[PDB]
Amino acid sequence: KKTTIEITEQQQKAKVTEAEINIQREHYRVVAAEGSMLYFLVISLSVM
């Protein structure tokens, strides 16, 4: 009875931690995206 309630709490804490990352995925998309865009430019620069 206890371990079933303690699993349903964890599953509700899972959806909250999945939501709060998927928000902080979009906040740092702009930072990451800029990093990627600059690397492919740096690879092109190797070829010349």
Side-chain angles (χ1 to χ4, degrees):
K1 282 174 194 177
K2 283 175 189 181
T3 49
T4 45
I5 289 172
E6 285 183 30
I7 283 165
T8 54
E9 280 180 40
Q10 280 179 50
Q11 288 171 357
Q12 289 160 18
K13 281 183 189 175
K15 289 178 187 179
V16 166
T17 53
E18 282 172 47
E20 280 187 13
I21 284 173
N22 292 11
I23 285 174
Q24 287 191 334
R25 280 297 210 81
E26 291 185 341
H27 274 284
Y28 287 94
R29 155 63 54 74
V30 184
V31 170
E34 202 284 318
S36 179
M37 152 274 167
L38 222 171
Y39 170 78
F40 287 118
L41 197 151
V42 159
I43 288 298
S44 304
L45 186 279
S46 73
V47 176
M48 73 172 287

mmCIF file of all heavy atoms in Angstrom:
data_model
loop_
_atom_site.group_PDB
_atom_site.id
_atom_site.type_symbol
_atom_site.label_atom_id
_atom_site.label_comp_id
_atom_site.label_asym_id
_atom_site.label_seq_id
_atom_site.Cartn_x
_atom_site.Cartn_y
_atom_site.Cartn_z
ATOM 1 N N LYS A 1 0.855 -1.221 0.000
ATOM 2 C CA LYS A 1 0.000 0.000 0.000
ATOM 3 C C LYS A 1 0.880 1.256 0.000
ATOM 4 O O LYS A 1 0.523 2.216 -0.712
ATOM 5 C CB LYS A 1 -0.946 0.030 1.205
ATOM 6 C CG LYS A 1 -2.177 -0.855 1.078
ATOM 7 C CD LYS A 1 -2.998 -0.899 2.346
ATOM 8 C CE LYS A 1 -4.014 -2.021 2.362
ATOM 9 N NZ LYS A 1 -4.738 -2.075 3.654
ATOM 10 N N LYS A 2 1.971 1.252 0.774
ATOM 11 C CA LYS A 2 2.913 2.399 0.887
ATOM 12 C C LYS A 2 3.691 2.557 -0.425
ATOM 13 O O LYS A 2 3.704 3.689 -0.951
ATOM 14 C CB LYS A 2 3.848 2.236 2.092
ATOM 15 C CG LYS A 2 3.207 2.550 3.438
ATOM 16 C CD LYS A 2 4.104 2.283 4.628
ATOM 17 C CE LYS A 2 3.374 2.397 5.950
ATOM 18 N NZ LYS A 2 4.274 2.148 7.100
ATOM 19 N N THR A 3 4.290 1.473 -0.939
ATOM 20 C CA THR A 3 5.190 1.488 -2.131
ATOM 21 C C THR A 3 4.423 1.872 -3.408
ATOM 22 O O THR A 3 5.068 2.429 -4.313
ATOM 23 C CB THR A 3 5.930 0.158 -2.335
ATOM 24 O OG1 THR A 3 4.987 -0.910 -2.255
ATOM 25 C CG2 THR A 3 7.038 -0.060 -1.329
ATOM 26 N N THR A 4 3.117 1.585 -3.495
ATOM 27 C CA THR A 4 2.252 1.996 -4.637
ATOM 28 C C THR A 4 2.074 3.518 -4.618
ATOM 29 O O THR A 4 2.228 4.131 -5.691
ATOM 30 C CB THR A 4 0.892 1.285 -4.632
ATOM 31 O OG1 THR A 4 0.371 1.309 -3.303
ATOM 32 C CG2 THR A 4 0.975 -0.139 -5.135
ATOM 33 N N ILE A 5 1.765 4.096 -3.451
ATOM 34 C CA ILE A 5 1.627 5.573 -3.252
ATOM 35 C C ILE A 5 2.989 6.238 -3.514
ATOM 36 O O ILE A 5 3.001 7.293 -4.178
ATOM 37 C CB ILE A 5 1.042 5.905 -1.860
ATOM 38 C CG1 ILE A 5 -0.438 5.513 -1.781
ATOM 39 C CG2 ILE A 5 1.254 7.374 -1.500
ATOM 40 C CD1 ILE A 5 -1.051 5.626 -0.400
ATOM 41 N N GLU A 6 4.086 5.639 -3.036
ATOM 42 C CA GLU A 6 5.467 6.180 -3.193
ATOM 43 C C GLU A 6 5.936 6.082 -4.652
ATOM 44 O O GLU A 6 6.854 6.843 -5.009
ATOM 45 C CB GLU A 6 6.461 5.468 -2.272
ATOM 46 C CG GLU A 6 6.349 5.894 -0.818
ATOM 47 C CD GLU A 6 7.355 5.259 0.131
ATOM 48 O OE1 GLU A 6 8.477 4.937 -0.316
ATOM 49 O OE2 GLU A 6 7.016 5.089 1.320
ATOM 50 N N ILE A 7 5.356 5.180 -5.456
ATOM 51 C CA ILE A 7 5.614 5.085 -6.927
ATOM 52 C C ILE A 7 4.802 6.174 -7.646
ATOM 53 O O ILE A 7 5.378 6.817 -8.545
ATOM 54 C CB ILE A 7 5.335 3.663 -7.470
ATOM 55 C CG1 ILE A 7 6.470 2.702 -7.105
ATOM 56 C CG2 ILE A 7 5.089 3.670 -8.975
ATOM 57 C CD1 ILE A 7 6.128 1.238 -7.270
ATOM 58 N N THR A 8 3.530 6.377 -7.283
ATOM 59 C CA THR A 8 2.639 7.394 -7.915
ATOM 60 C C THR A 8 3.155 8.811 -7.619
ATOM 61 O O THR A 8 2.942 9.689 -8.478
ATOM 62 C CB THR A 8 1.170 7.252 -7.492
ATOM 63 O OG1 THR A 8 1.099 7.274 -6.067
ATOM 64 C CG2 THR A 8 0.524 5.994 -8.028
ATOM 65 N N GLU A 9 3.794 9.031 -6.463
ATOM 66 C CA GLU A 9 4.469 10.316 -6.123
ATOM 67 C C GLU A 9 5.667 10.525 -7.058
ATOM 68 O O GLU A 9 5.799 11.645 -7.588
ATOM 69 C CB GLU A 9 4.925 10.353 -4.661
ATOM 70 C CG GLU A 9 3.814 10.688 -3.682
ATOM 71 C CD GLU A 9 4.243 10.740 -2.223
ATOM 72 O OE1 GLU A 9 5.349 11.248 -1.946
ATOM 73 O OE2 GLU A 9 3.471 10.267 -1.364
ATOM 74 N N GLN A 10 6.499 9.493 -7.246
ATOM 75 C CA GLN A 10 7.703 9.528 -8.122
ATOM 76 C C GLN A 10 7.293 9.821 -9.570
ATOM 77 O O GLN A 10 7.978 10.641 -10.206
ATOM 78 C CB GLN A 10 8.482 8.214 -8.063
ATOM 79 C CG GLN A 10 9.380 8.093 -6.843
ATOM 80 C CD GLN A 10 10.104 6.768 -6.807
ATOM 81 O OE1 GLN A 10 10.716 6.343 -7.788
ATOM 82 N NE2 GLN A 10 10.044 6.101 -5.666
ATOM 83 N N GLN A 11 6.230 9.173 -10.063
ATOM 84 C CA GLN A 11 5.690 9.358 -11.442
ATOM 85 C C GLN A 11 5.204 10.802 -11.637
ATOM 86 O O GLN A 11 5.371 11.322 -12.757
ATOM 87 C CB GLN A 11 4.554 8.370 -11.721
ATOM 88 C CG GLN A 11 5.027 6.934 -11.900
ATOM 89 C CD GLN A 11 3.887 5.944 -11.965
ATOM 90 O OE1 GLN A 11 2.716 6.292 -11.821
ATOM 91 N NE2 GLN A 11 4.228 4.685 -12.189
ATOM 92 N N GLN A 12 4.624 11.415 -10.599
ATOM 93 C CA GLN A 12 4.166 12.834 -10.600
ATOM 94 C C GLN A 12 5.369 13.781 -10.480
ATOM 95 O O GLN A 12 5.280 14.896 -11.029
ATOM 96 C CB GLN A 12 3.158 13.077 -9.475
ATOM 97 C CG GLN A 12 1.810 12.411 -9.724
ATOM 98 C CD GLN A 12 0.989 12.233 -8.468
ATOM 99 O OE1 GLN A 12 1.229 12.868 -7.442
ATOM 100 N NE2 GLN A 12 0.001 11.356 -8.542
ATOM 101 N N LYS A 13 6.436 13.370 -9.782
ATOM 102 C CA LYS A 13 7.730 14.109 -9.702
ATOM 103 C C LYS A 13 8.524 13.945 -11.006
ATOM 104 O O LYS A 13 9.369 14.818 -11.279
ATOM 105 C CB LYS A 13 8.587 13.636 -8.522
ATOM 106 C CG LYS A 13 8.181 14.184 -7.162
ATOM 107 C CD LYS A 13 9.108 13.747 -6.047
ATOM 108 C CE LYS A 13 8.590 14.093 -4.667
ATOM 109 N NZ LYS A 13 9.467 13.553 -3.601
ATOM 110 N N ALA A 14 8.290 12.867 -11.765
ATOM 111 C CA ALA A 14 8.937 12.602 -13.072
ATOM 112 C C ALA A 14 8.410 13.592 -14.114
ATOM 113 O O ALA A 14 9.242 14.233 -14.783
ATOM 114 C CB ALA A 14 8.700 11.177 -13.513
ATOM 115 N N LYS A 15 7.083 13.707 -14.236
ATOM 116 C CA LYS A 15 6.392 14.605 -15.206
ATOM 117 C C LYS A 15 6.756 16.070 -14.930
ATOM 118 O O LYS A 15 6.817 16.841 -15.907
ATOM 119 C CB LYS A 15 4.873 14.405 -15.157
ATOM 120 C CG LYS A 15 4.382 13.090 -15.745
ATOM 121 C CD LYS A 15 2.884 12.896 -15.646
ATOM 122 C CE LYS A 15 2.444 11.514 -16.081
ATOM 123 N NZ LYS A 15 0.977 11.340 -15.958
ATOM 124 N N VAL A 16 6.985 16.439 -13.663
ATOM 125 C CA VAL A 16 7.387 17.818 -13.247
ATOM 126 C C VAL A 16 8.840 18.074 -13.678
ATOM 127 O O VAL A 16 9.092 19.167 -14.222
ATOM 128 C CB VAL A 16 7.178 18.052 -11.737
ATOM 129 C CG1 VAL A 16 7.884 19.307 -11.237
ATOM 130 C CG2 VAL A 16 5.697 18.109 -11.387
ATOM 131 N N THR A 17 9.756 17.127 -13.446
ATOM 132 C CA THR A 17 11.197 17.249 -13.809
ATOM 133 C C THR A 17 11.386 17.134 -15.328
ATOM 134 O O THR A 17 12.373 17.708 -15.825
ATOM 135 C CB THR A 17 12.071 16.218 -13.087
ATOM 136 O OG1 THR A 17 11.518 14.919 -13.305
ATOM 137 C CG2 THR A 17 12.192 16.489 -11.603
ATOM 138 N N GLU A 18 10.506 16.411 -16.031
ATOM 139 C CA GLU A 18 10.505 16.321 -17.520
ATOM 140 C C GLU A 18 10.025 17.653 -18.113
ATOM 141 O O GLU A 18 10.641 18.108 -19.097
ATOM 142 C CB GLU A 18 9.633 15.164 -18.016
ATOM 143 C CG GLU A 18 10.293 13.802 -17.882
ATOM 144 C CD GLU A 18 9.384 12.619 -18.177
ATOM 145 O OE1 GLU A 18 8.679 12.657 -19.206
ATOM 146 O OE2 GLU A 18 9.379 11.662 -17.374
ATOM 147 N N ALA A 19 8.967 18.240 -17.540
ATOM 148 C CA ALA A 19 8.392 19.550 -17.934
ATOM 149 C C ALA A 19 9.429 20.658 -17.724
ATOM 150 O O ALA A 19 9.640 21.445 -18.666
ATOM 151 C CB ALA A 19 7.130 19.832 -17.151
ATOM 152 N N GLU A 20 10.054 20.704 -16.543
ATOM 153 C CA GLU A 20 10.982 21.793 -16.121
ATOM 154 C C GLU A 20 12.292 21.742 -16.917
ATOM 155 O O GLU A 20 12.933 22.807 -17.022
ATOM 156 C CB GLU A 20 11.267 21.741 -14.618
ATOM 157 C CG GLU A 20 10.163 22.363 -13.776
ATOM 158 C CD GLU A 20 10.458 22.498 -12.290
ATOM 159 O OE1 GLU A 20 11.634 22.344 -11.894
ATOM 160 O OE2 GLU A 20 9.505 22.763 -11.527
ATOM 161 N N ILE A 21 12.687 20.576 -17.442
ATOM 162 C CA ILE A 21 13.845 20.446 -18.380
ATOM 163 C C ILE A 21 13.421 20.942 -19.768
ATOM 164 O O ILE A 21 14.173 21.744 -20.344
ATOM 165 C CB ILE A 21 14.401 19.007 -18.416
ATOM 166 C CG1 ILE A 21 15.237 18.726 -17.165
ATOM 167 C CG2 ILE A 21 15.195 18.749 -19.693
ATOM 168 C CD1 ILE A 21 15.689 17.290 -17.029
ATOM 169 N N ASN A 22 12.269 20.488 -20.277
ATOM 170 C CA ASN A 22 11.746 20.827 -21.631
ATOM 171 C C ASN A 22 11.481 22.337 -21.750
ATOM 172 O O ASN A 22 11.444 22.823 -22.897
ATOM 173 C CB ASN A 22 10.494 20.013 -21.978
ATOM 174 C CG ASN A 22 10.774 18.536 -22.172
ATOM 175 O OD1 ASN A 22 11.860 18.051 -21.859
ATOM 176 N ND2 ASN A 22 9.795 17.807 -22.681
ATOM 177 N N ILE A 23 11.285 23.043 -20.629
ATOM 178 C CA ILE A 23 11.270 24.537 -20.565
ATOM 179 C C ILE A 23 12.717 25.040 -20.673
ATOM 180 O O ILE A 23 12.955 25.944 -21.501
ATOM 181 C CB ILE A 23 10.530 25.046 -19.305
ATOM 182 C CG1 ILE A 23 9.014 24.890 -19.471
ATOM 183 C CG2 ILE A 23 10.916 26.484 -18.968
ATOM 184 C CD1 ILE A 23 8.197 25.235 -18.241
ATOM 185 N N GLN A 24 13.646 24.471 -19.893
ATOM 186 C CA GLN A 24 15.090 24.856 -19.880
ATOM 187 C C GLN A 24 15.832 24.271 -21.092
ATOM 188 O O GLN A 24 17.015 24.613 -21.269
ATOM 189 C CB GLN A 24 15.764 24.420 -18.578
ATOM 190 C CG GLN A 24 15.364 25.268 -17.379
ATOM 191 C CD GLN A 24 16.233 25.007 -16.175
ATOM 192 O OE1 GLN A 24 16.807 23.930 -16.014
ATOM 193 N NE2 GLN A 24 16.341 26.005 -15.312
ATOM 194 N N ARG A 25 15.189 23.404 -21.878
ATOM 195 C CA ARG A 25 15.661 23.005 -23.232
ATOM 196 C C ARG A 25 15.519 24.207 -24.173
ATOM 197 O O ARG A 25 16.470 24.470 -24.930
ATOM 198 C CB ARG A 25 14.864 21.811 -23.773
ATOM 199 C CG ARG A 25 15.288 20.449 -23.236
ATOM 200 C CD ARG A 25 16.709 20.098 -23.627
ATOM 201 N NE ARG A 25 16.944 18.669 -23.765
ATOM 202 C CZ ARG A 25 16.634 17.933 -24.835
ATOM 203 N NH1 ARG A 25 16.045 18.475 -25.892
ATOM 204 N NH2 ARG A 25 16.909 16.639 -24.838
ATOM 205 N N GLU A 26 14.371 24.894 -24.120
ATOM 206 C CA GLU A 26 14.000 26.012 -25.032
ATOM 207 C C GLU A 26 14.735 27.300 -24.635
ATOM 208 O O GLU A 26 15.011 28.110 -25.545
ATOM 209 C CB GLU A 26 12.484 26.222 -25.036
ATOM 210 C CG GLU A 26 11.720 25.087 -25.702
ATOM 211 C CD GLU A 26 10.221 25.307 -25.839
ATOM 212 O OE1 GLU A 26 9.674 26.164 -25.111
ATOM 213 O OE2 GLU A 26 9.602 24.617 -26.674
ATOM 214 N N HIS A 27 15.021 27.502 -23.342
ATOM 215 C CA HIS A 27 15.778 28.678 -22.828
ATOM 216 C C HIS A 27 17.214 28.653 -23.371
ATOM 217 O O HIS A 27 17.696 29.732 -23.771
ATOM 218 C CB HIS A 27 15.740 28.759 -21.291
ATOM 219 C CG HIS A 27 14.541 29.461 -20.745
ATOM 220 N ND1 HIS A 27 14.417 30.837 -20.774
ATOM 221 C CD2 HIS A 27 13.423 28.994 -20.147
ATOM 222 C CE1 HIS A 27 13.271 31.185 -20.224
ATOM 223 N NE2 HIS A 27 12.642 30.071 -19.830
ATOM 224 N N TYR A 28 17.858 27.477 -23.396
ATOM 225 C CA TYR A 28 19.284 27.275 -23.785
ATOM 226 C C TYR A 28 19.409 26.710 -25.209
ATOM 227 O O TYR A 28 20.546 26.423 -25.627
ATOM 228 C CB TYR A 28 19.995 26.379 -22.767
ATOM 229 C CG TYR A 28 20.278 27.060 -21.453
ATOM 230 C CD1 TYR A 28 19.402 26.958 -20.383
ATOM 231 C CD2 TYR A 28 21.417 27.829 -21.284
ATOM 232 C CE1 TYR A 28 19.654 27.591 -19.175
ATOM 233 C CE2 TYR A 28 21.683 28.473 -20.084
ATOM 234 C CZ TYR A 28 20.801 28.350 -19.023
ATOM 235 O OH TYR A 28 21.061 28.979 -17.841
ATOM 236 N N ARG A 29 18.292 26.552 -25.930
ATOM 237 C CA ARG A 29 18.267 26.274 -27.393
ATOM 238 C C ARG A 29 19.107 27.353 -28.082
ATOM 239 O O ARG A 29 20.017 26.977 -28.835
ATOM 240 C CB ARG A 29 16.814 26.209 -27.890
ATOM 241 C CG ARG A 29 16.577 26.508 -29.367
ATOM 242 C CD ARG A 29 17.234 25.555 -30.351
ATOM 243 N NE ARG A 29 16.918 24.145 -30.137
ATOM 244 C CZ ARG A 29 15.757 23.547 -30.416
ATOM 245 N NH1 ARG A 29 14.736 24.227 -30.917
ATOM 246 N NH2 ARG A 29 15.614 22.251 -30.180
ATOM 247 N N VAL A 30 18.842 28.630 -27.769
ATOM 248 C CA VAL A 30 19.441 29.835 -28.427
ATOM 249 C C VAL A 30 20.964 29.814 -28.235
ATOM 250 O O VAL A 30 21.677 30.166 -29.194
ATOM 251 C CB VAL A 30 18.835 31.156 -27.904
ATOM 252 C CG1 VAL A 30 19.378 32.363 -28.656
ATOM 253 C CG2 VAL A 30 17.311 31.156 -27.960
ATOM 254 N N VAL A 31 21.431 29.414 -27.049
ATOM 255 C CA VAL A 31 22.877 29.332 -26.670
ATOM 256 C C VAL A 31 23.541 28.189 -27.450
ATOM 257 O O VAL A 31 24.605 28.427 -28.055
ATOM 258 C CB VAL A 31 23.043 29.149 -25.147
ATOM 259 C CG1 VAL A 31 24.480 28.823 -24.752
ATOM 260 C CG2 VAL A 31 22.534 30.368 -24.387
ATOM 261 N N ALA A 32 22.943 26.997 -27.408
ATOM 262 C CA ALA A 32 23.406 25.775 -28.108
ATOM 263 C C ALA A 32 23.436 26.020 -29.620
ATOM 264 O O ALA A 32 24.494 25.790 -30.231
ATOM 265 C CB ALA A 32 22.499 24.618 -27.770
ATOM 266 N N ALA A 33 22.304 26.463 -30.184
ATOM 267 C CA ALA A 33 22.089 26.713 -31.631
ATOM 268 C C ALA A 33 23.218 27.587 -32.180
ATOM 269 O O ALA A 33 23.735 27.267 -33.268
ATOM 270 C CB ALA A 33 20.745 27.361 -31.864
ATOM 271 N N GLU A 34 23.577 28.641 -31.441
ATOM 272 C CA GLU A 34 24.652 29.604 -31.805
ATOM 273 C C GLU A 34 25.998 28.873 -31.813
ATOM 274 O O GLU A 34 26.801 29.147 -32.718
ATOM 275 C CB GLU A 34 24.654 30.801 -30.849
ATOM 276 C CG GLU A 34 25.317 32.043 -31.422
ATOM 277 C CD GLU A 34 26.834 32.011 -31.466
ATOM 278 O OE1 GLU A 34 27.448 31.545 -30.481
ATOM 279 O OE2 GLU A 34 27.399 32.436 -32.494
ATOM 280 N N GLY A 35 26.223 27.975 -30.850
ATOM 281 C CA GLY A 35 27.430 27.128 -30.763
ATOM 282 C C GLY A 35 27.570 26.183 -31.947
ATOM 283 O O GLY A 35 28.694 26.047 -32.457
ATOM 284 N N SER A 36 26.475 25.541 -32.362
ATOM 285 C CA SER A 36 26.432 24.589 -33.502
ATOM 286 C C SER A 36 26.754 25.339 -34.795
ATOM 287 O O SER A 36 27.706 24.943 -35.493
ATOM 288 C CB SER A 36 25.090 23.908 -33.588
ATOM 289 O OG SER A 36 25.042 23.009 -34.686
ATOM 290 N N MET A 37 25.978 26.393 -35.075
ATOM 291 C CA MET A 37 26.080 27.281 -36.271
ATOM 292 C C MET A 37 27.525 27.765 -36.461
ATOM 293 O O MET A 37 27.942 27.896 -37.628
ATOM 294 C CB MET A 37 25.109 28.466 -36.129
ATOM 295 C CG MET A 37 25.508 29.741 -36.846
ATOM 296 S SD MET A 37 26.608 30.764 -35.837
ATOM 297 C CE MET A 37 27.195 31.925 -37.070
ATOM 298 N N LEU A 38 28.257 28.008 -35.367
ATOM 299 C CA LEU A 38 29.657 28.522 -35.387
ATOM 300 C C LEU A 38 30.646 27.380 -35.663
ATOM 301 O O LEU A 38 31.685 27.655 -36.283
ATOM 302 C CB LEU A 38 29.981 29.227 -34.065
ATOM 303 C CG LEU A 38 30.770 30.527 -34.203
ATOM 304 C CD1 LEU A 38 30.847 31.252 -32.870
ATOM 305 C CD2 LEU A 38 32.163 30.271 -34.762
ATOM 306 N N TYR A 39 30.351 26.155 -35.223
ATOM 307 C CA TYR A 39 31.236 24.975 -35.416
ATOM 308 C C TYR A 39 31.291 24.583 -36.898
ATOM 309 O O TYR A 39 32.400 24.296 -37.381
ATOM 310 C CB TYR A 39 30.789 23.779 -34.573
ATOM 311 C CG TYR A 39 31.509 22.500 -34.913
ATOM 312 C CD1 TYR A 39 32.796 22.265 -34.459
ATOM 313 C CD2 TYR A 39 30.922 21.542 -35.724
ATOM 314 C CE1 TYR A 39 33.472 21.098 -34.779
ATOM 315 C CE2 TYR A 39 31.582 20.368 -36.052
ATOM 316 C CZ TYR A 39 32.864 20.146 -35.579
ATOM 317 O OH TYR A 39 33.519 18.992 -35.895
ATOM 318 N N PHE A 40 30.145 24.531 -37.585
ATOM 319 C CA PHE A 40 30.054 24.139 -39.019
ATOM 320 C C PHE A 40 30.794 25.160 -39.890
ATOM 321 O O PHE A 40 31.338 24.766 -40.941
ATOM 322 C CB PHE A 40 28.600 23.987 -39.471
ATOM 323 C CG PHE A 40 27.925 22.756 -38.930
ATOM 324 C CD1 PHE A 40 26.819 22.858 -38.098
ATOM 325 C CD2 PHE A 40 28.404 21.494 -39.248
ATOM 326 C CE1 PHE A 40 26.207 21.721 -37.596
ATOM 327 C CE2 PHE A 40 27.792 20.358 -38.742
ATOM 328 C CZ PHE A 40 26.696 20.475 -37.916
ATOM 329 N N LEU A 41 30.798 26.425 -39.463
ATOM 330 C CA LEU A 41 31.587 27.523 -40.081
ATOM 331 C C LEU A 41 33.083 27.230 -39.896
ATOM 332 O O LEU A 41 33.837 27.396 -40.873
ATOM 333 C CB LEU A 41 31.176 28.847 -39.429
ATOM 334 C CG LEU A 41 31.561 30.115 -40.187
ATOM 335 C CD1 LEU A 41 30.563 31.222 -39.892
ATOM 336 C CD2 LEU A 41 32.978 30.560 -39.849
ATOM 337 N N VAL A 42 33.482 26.797 -38.694
ATOM 338 C CA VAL A 42 34.891 26.469 -38.302
ATOM 339 C C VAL A 42 35.386 25.236 -39.076
ATOM 340 O O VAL A 42 36.595 25.178 -39.366
ATOM 341 C CB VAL A 42 35.009 26.285 -36.773
ATOM 342 C CG1 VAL A 42 36.226 25.472 -36.352
ATOM 343 C CG2 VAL A 42 34.996 27.625 -36.053
ATOM 344 N N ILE A 43 34.502 24.283 -39.388
ATOM 345 C CA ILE A 43 34.835 23.076 -40.205
ATOM 346 C C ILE A 43 35.063 23.507 -41.660
ATOM 347 O O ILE A 43 36.024 23.005 -42.263
ATOM 348 C CB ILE A 43 33.749 21.985 -40.063
ATOM 349 C CG1 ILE A 43 33.801 21.324 -38.681
ATOM 350 C CG2 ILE A 43 33.831 20.949 -41.180
ATOM 351 C CD1 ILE A 43 35.100 20.596 -38.377
ATOM 352 N N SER A 44 34.209 24.384 -42.202
ATOM 353 C CA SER A 44 34.351 24.962 -43.564
ATOM 354 C C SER A 44 35.724 25.635 -43.686
ATOM 355 O O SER A 44 36.420 25.372 -44.683
ATOM 356 C CB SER A 44 33.230 25.923 -43.883
ATOM 357 O OG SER A 44 31.965 25.292 -43.745
ATOM 358 N N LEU A 45 36.106 26.421 -42.672
ATOM 359 C CA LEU A 45 37.380 27.194 -42.591
ATOM 360 C C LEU A 45 38.592 26.253 -42.708
ATOM 361 O O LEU A 45 39.625 26.701 -43.226
ATOM 362 C CB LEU A 45 37.376 27.987 -41.274
ATOM 363 C CG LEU A 45 38.522 28.973 -41.021
ATOM 364 C CD1 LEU A 45 39.778 28.269 -40.519
ATOM 365 C CD2 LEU A 45 38.821 29.829 -42.249
ATOM 366 N N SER A 46 38.474 24.997 -42.267
ATOM 367 C CA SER A 46 39.541 23.962 -42.373
ATOM 368 C C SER A 46 39.823 23.601 -43.839
ATOM 369 O O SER A 46 40.982 23.275 -44.153
ATOM 370 C CB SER A 46 39.194 22.726 -41.573
ATOM 371 O OG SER A 46 38.162 21.972 -42.192
ATOM 372 N N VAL A 47 38.800 23.643 -44.697
ATOM 373 C CA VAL A 47 38.827 23.060 -46.073
ATOM 374 C C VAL A 47 39.610 23.982 -47.022
ATOM 375 O O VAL A 47 40.264 23.439 -47.936
ATOM 376 C CB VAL A 47 37.398 22.767 -46.581
ATOM 377 C CG1 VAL A 47 37.386 22.253 -48.015
ATOM 378 C CG2 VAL A 47 36.666 21.792 -45.664
ATOM 379 N N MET A 48 39.562 25.308 -46.826
ATOM 380 C CA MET A 48 40.189 26.310 -47.738
ATOM 381 C C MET A 48 41.709 26.111 -47.793
ATOM 382 O O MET A 48 42.267 26.182 -48.905
ATOM 383 C CB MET A 48 39.884 27.756 -47.316
ATOM 384 C CG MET A 48 40.617 28.248 -46.065
ATOM 385 S SD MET A 48 40.409 30.019 -45.758
ATOM 386 C CE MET A 48 41.442 30.678 -47.064
#
